[PDB]
Amino acid sequence: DAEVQKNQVLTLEDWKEKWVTRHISFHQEQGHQLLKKHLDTFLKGQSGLRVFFPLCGKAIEMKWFADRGHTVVGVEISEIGIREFFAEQNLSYTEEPLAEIAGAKVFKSSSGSISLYCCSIFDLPRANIGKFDRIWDRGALVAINPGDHDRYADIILSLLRKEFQYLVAVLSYDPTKHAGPPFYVPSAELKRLFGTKCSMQCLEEVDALEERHKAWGLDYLFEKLYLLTEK
Numbered sequence: 648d649a650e651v652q653k654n655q656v657l658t659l660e661d662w663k664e665k666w667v668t669r670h671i672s673f674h675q676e677q678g679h680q681l682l683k684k685h686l687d688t689f690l691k692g693q694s695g696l697r698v699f700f701p702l703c704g705k706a707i708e709m710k711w712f713a714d715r716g717h718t719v720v721g722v723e724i725s726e727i728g729i730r731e732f733f734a735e736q737n738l739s740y741t742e743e744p745l746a747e748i749a750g751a752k753v754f755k756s757s758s759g760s761i762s763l764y765c766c767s768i769f770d771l772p773r774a775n776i777g778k779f780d781r782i783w784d785r786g787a788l789v790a791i792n793p794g795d796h797d798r799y800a801d802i803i804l805s806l807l808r809k810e811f812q813y814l815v816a817v818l819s820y821d822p823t824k825h826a827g828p829p830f831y832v833p834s835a836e837l838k839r840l841f842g843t844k845c846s847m848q849c850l851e852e853v854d855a856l857e858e859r860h861k862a863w864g865l866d867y868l869f870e871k872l873y874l875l876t877e878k
């Protein structure tokens with residue numbers, strides 16, 4: 648069952664077409680409510696953290712971190728989504744080509760609080776973006792093709808400082824009922840991916856079934872939030 652979606656794929660071009668055609672149902676216009684609940688503690692006592700958002704879309708919470716004085720980096724293959732982030736958050740920005748990745752670009756807020764790399768996360772290591780105190784992962788690990796999970800996890804691990812907090816949101820549902828994204832990523836997979844190098848703790852399990860999931864086929868959907876930290 649954890650293997651049912653093992654061969655499913657969305658490509659980089661499919662994701663870019665979703666943005667062009669406005670198939671962006673993943674986006675949360677009010678921001679993620681579990682992060683909101685856990686944010687203070689996530690940041691508790693710390694100043695000027697470097698925070699990474701994989702597969703960031705136009706995630707409005709990048710502004711939450713930037714407003715609190717933390718440095719934010721995201722990676723997103725869609726230039727449309729990146730430009731929409733800055734428009735929606737009312738921020739000016741520069742654009743620079745990325746010399747190490749053909750065709751790619753980096754978009755930075757005017758005083759540098761937020762830098763969004765327009766490229767694949769699988770190419771991002773060549774952009775020399777350093778390491779992070781915090782990672783917020785929502786619609787990211789669950790968006791990655793299942794076949795790419797090992798590669799994805801090693802990149803996330805390579806981006807962590809020695810001390811870190813890594814919050815990851817997954818969704819539990821019957822994967823024989825729906826072909827992702829968002830893919831089904833159970834606890835056991837999280838543990839396969841990160842548990843030798845991370846301590847884990849489940850923080851939350853919440854009902855996410857919306858009737859919009861009805862015709863999907865789903866009669867259960869729960870969102871789970873995990874906190875990963877140094878072993």
Ligand SMILES: Nc1ncnc2c1ncn2[C@@H]1O[C@H](CSCC[C@H](N)C(=O)O)[C@@H](O)[C@H]1O
Pocket residue numbers: 659662663673674675701702703704705706722723724725728766767768769785786787790
């Ligand atoms: N390999 C990849 N590299 C970079 N972005 C990718 C990617 N695969 C998918 N994406 C982008 O990943 C996003 C997943 S949808 C979730 C967006 C955002 N994290 C949110 O919480 O709203 C899309 O914006 C899609 O274009």
